[PDB]
Amino acid sequence: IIGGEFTTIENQPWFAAIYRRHRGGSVTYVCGGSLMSPCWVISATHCFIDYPKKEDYIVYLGRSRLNSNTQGEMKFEVENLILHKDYSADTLAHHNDIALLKIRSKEGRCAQPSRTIQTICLPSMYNDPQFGTSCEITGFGKEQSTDYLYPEQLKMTVVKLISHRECQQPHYYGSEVTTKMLCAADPQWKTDSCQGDSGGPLVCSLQGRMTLTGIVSWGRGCALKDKPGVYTRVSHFLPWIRSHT
């Protein structure tokens, strides 16, 4: 997250932190995700398609820092990794960029809700927020595109939704962005999501309800002028999410 503010897991309790174990035993951060139900985390298929072995992933809920054990956190393995069968990647755009991770503790349990671990609600069909709505993102991604290290402390920022018509303008993304994707960005281009934030939530308050409106997917650069962050539109995928859970 470029710009924005430092925060802690009690203010984003649906956020999941997903790491990968390498041969040799080092572990490194991969992507964010969101808790949708005690045993199901939803993220982005591009985060996993090149390393599709479910046994390699570690998922934490309740965790506020990259490298330390936050009180109250919970650690998990992945019982079932489900990637979308029509996922694909062009030069910029990613398609059907959505995945499901069924989670279990070493005793075989799903997440236990608490003050620092909670679900986020899914959207309803054909009801997303209007353009111009402010929504939040969260993640452990890069603070600047030239950094190679990720921030030790969890970050968040707020961005505004952009219409399909504006996002398809030729200096934005043209016909590369489709009606299954949603654009969002800062009007002054000073804060944004970035590499390391993929898979994480775009949460919008709609009609009084905090809602998982999008999943961090792709973008040209980070915080660049006329280059919005682009997000999977979760409401289109409601029949796929129910059928696979």
Name the residues annotated as catalytic: 46, 97, 198
Nearer to ligand 675, 159 or 241 (CB): 159
- State the minimum distance, in angstroms, from the CB of residue 188 to ligand 675: 15
Closer CB to ligand 675, residue 39 or residue 83? 83
Nearer to ligand 675, 96 or 195 (CB): 195
d(CA 116, CA 121): 16
User: Least distance from C-beta 46 to ligand 675, angstroms?
Assistant: 4
Q: Cα–Cα distance between 188 and 10 in angstroms, integer?
A: 29
Q: Are 227 and 221 in contact (CB under 8 A)?
A: yes
Torsion sign, CA atoms 59, 65, 71, 72: negative
Where along the sequence are the contacts to ligand 675 (CB under 6 A)? Answer: 46, 192-195, 198, 216, 218-219, 222, 229
CB of 74 to ligand 675, least distance (A): 26
Residue whose tokens read 């040209």: 220
CA 245, 47, 237, 234 torsion-angle sign:
positive
Residue 10 or 131: which CB sits closer to ligand 675?
131
The nearest distance, CB 207 to ligand 675, in angstroms, is: 26
Q: How far is the CB of 115 from ligand 675 (least distance, A)?
A: 30
Q: Which is nearer to ligand 675, 43 or 198 (CB)?
A: 198
